[PDB]
């Protein structure tokens with residue numbers, strides 16, 4: 001059973017700005033997703049301090065970057081807190097309505113697209129490089145779900161039929177044809193060093209056969 005939802009007006013407006021605005025500095029999408037992963041990892045780490053059983057779904061707190069040139073996908077995986085179905089539907093746990101309003105006002109006052117993460121809506125920067133985004137998530141309190149959107153004002157949510165993940169979030173970026181540089185090992189290493197050099201969790205960049 002696949003449920004189809006309309007994005008709230010503000011989110012459709014934010015996604016349209018990301019997709020339609022001429023802005024060459026697209027590489028910042030990666031630090032925004034890594035920042036989201038780091039925040040999710042902090043959340044499960046903090047909860048686990050008072051309830052160690054919260055890590056029964058996996059003790060390792062890490063971030064993996066997985067390029068796949070055959071499928072033209074770049075996947076960001078973390079073993080963070082994950083999201084319940086309700087939080088996935090509610091703009092992937094973000095304050096997207098108020099954050100978009102504040103971000104739009106900031107853009108009128110001299111801010112630029114790279115500041116998106118400052119407003120709590122950095123996830124949507126995925127649309128700088130992806131024509132489609134699939135988010136697989138598993139929270140300790142809910143089942144595994146797959147969220148997906150190619151923008152156009154709608155997203156879908158279904159229970160995930162894929163392999164059980166334990167706990168956390170996988171963001172699968174189905175890259176635009178002209179954005180394949182983000183599948184290159186040297187390019188990913190360069191961006192991680194430039195924008196995400198010192199973070200609280202290990203980042204492993206997978207290589208390809």
Ligand SMILES: CCSc1nc(C)nc(N)n1
Nearest residue numbers: 036037040082092093169
């Ligand atoms: C902190 C909520 S879990 C989460 N949410 C997003 C938007 N991304 C990631 N990695 N994890």
Ligand SMILES: [Mg+2]
Nearest residue numbers: 035039117118
């Ligand atoms: Mg922060």
